[PDB]
Each structure stands twice: as structure tokens, then as C-alpha cells.
Ligand binder design. Structure first.
Ligand SMILES: CN(C)CC[C@H](CSc1ccccc1)Nc1ccc(S(=O)(=O)NC(=O)c2ccc(N3CCN(Cc4ccccc4-c4ccc(Cl)cc4)CC3)cc2)cc1[N+](=O)[O-]
Length: 161
């Protein structure tokens, strides 16, 4: 088994890559290193990724640019990694006023939108910062709750699979 921070980064990388294969064009597989990521380290990791993909898709349909436009995530220009982090962390600090599995699904959904828009151009460093930022934020704020809910494995029963 692995520490929660490593389990959360491993699960963030596999959900982002799997979501990219879903896209008409996948840019992420080439621009990210999948050599040191093993979902096998995460307990029940495959079903967690399948569960998170089912839940994030239902979320994307239900809920459909103010700061993305400011941060130029859709630009070819190198981005401000420092500013996107404060904005992402603050956006997450607002989301987790209430802590439920549904709010966790939304955080992964936001990371998917930011990572997939960033991927069109090779902003690998920003995507990696965001994956690390999700991992650090989850270890600090979401870990006690995620732990008291069967862990990341809790998403498997929440999904209904
Ligand atoms: C059965 N089937 C026919 C219906 C499936 C229903 C409806 S779809 C859905 C709803 C919530 C989360 C995910 C998907 N499923 C469901 C229903 C409820 C729940 S829940 O009770 O556990 N959670 C919620 O109901 C919930 C959670 C978060 C939530 N948000 C709405 C607003 N967004 C906006 C937002 C605010 C601040 C910062 C960022 C964002 C944000 C986040 C992501 C994006 Cl992509 C864009 C903006 C935050 C999250 C809304 C509802 C979970 C789920 N679920 O797990 O899928």
C-alpha cells in the first residue's frame, strides 16, 4: 500500500489520462510521464477510477472562464503556475465548505477541465503542479473525511458499482 498523498496523485494521474482517451483528441498521454505511476499501489484503484469517471461525467452533464480567461489556460503562452495554484486552492477552499463525496467529484471535475484545456498546448508543468496541489490539499483537508468513508474505496459504493 502507499501513503494517502501518493495514492491521491496516482489516482489523479490515471483519471486524467483515462478521461483524455475519452476525448476526440488525447494530448495528455504524450505530454505526461506514465512510467512512475502504478494504480496497483492504490487499494481498489481501478474501480475507484471507473467510479470517479462515471460520477464526473454525470456531474459534467448536470452543471454547465472568469479566471481561466485571466490565466490564459487556453493560450499557447507559458502560464503563471504560481497564480493558477492560489486560484485553484481558493476555488477548492470554497468548494469544501461542505465535505461530501459529491464535492470531491466536483474537485476532480475541475482538475479535468483545467488539465484538458491546458493539454491542447504543452503546459505539462502546470498540470503536474495542479496534480501535486490536489494531492497536498487532499492530504491536509480531505484525508480525515475520506478515511472515515472507507477511504478512496468509498467512491465505489457511492457510485452504485
Ligand atoms: C441518479 N442520477 C439520475 C442522478 C445523479 C445525481 C446528479 S449529478 C451529480 C450531482 C452532484 C455531484 C456529481 C454529480 N448524482 C448525485 C447527486 C447528488 C450527489 S451529492 O449529494 O453527494 N452531491 C451533490 O448533490 C452536490 C455536490 C456538489 C455540487 N456542486 C454544485 C456547484 N459546483 C460549482 C462550483 C462551486 C465552487 C467552486 C467550483 C465549482 C465548480 C466545480 C466543478 C466544476 Cl466542473 C465547475 C465549477 C460545486 C459542486 C452540487 C451537488 C452526488 C451525485 N453523484 O455522485 O453523482
Amino acid at each position: 500500500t502507499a501513503d494517502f498523498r501518493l495514492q491521491t496523485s496516482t489516482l489523479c494521474h490515471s483519471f486524467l489520462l483515462a478521461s483524455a482517451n475519452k476525448q476526440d483528441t488525447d494530448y495528455l498521454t504524450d505530454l505526461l510521464d506514465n512510467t512512475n505511476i502504478d494504480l496497483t499501489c492504490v487499494p481498489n484503484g481501478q474501480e475507484i477510477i471507473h467510479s470517479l469517471l462515471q460520477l464526473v461525467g454525470d456531474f459534467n452533464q448536470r452543471f454547465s472562464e472568469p479566471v481561466a480567461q485571466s490565466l490564459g489556460i487556453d493560450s499557447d503562452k507559458p502560464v503563471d503556475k504560481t497564480a493558477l495554484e492560489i486560484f485553484y486552492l481558493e476555488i477548492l477552499n470554497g468548494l469544501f465548505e461542505k465535505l461530501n463525496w459529491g464535492r470531491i467529484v466536483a474537485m476532480f471535475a475541475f482538475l479535468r477541465i483545467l488539465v484538458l484545456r491546458l493539454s491542447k498546448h504543452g503546459h505539462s508543468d502546470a498540470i503536474q503542479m495542479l496534480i501535486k496541489t490536489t494531492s497536498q490539499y487532499s492530504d491536509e483537508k480531505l484525508k480525515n473525511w475520506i478515511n472515515l468513508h472507507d477511504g478512496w474505496s468509498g467512491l465505489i459504493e457511492f457510485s452504485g458499482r
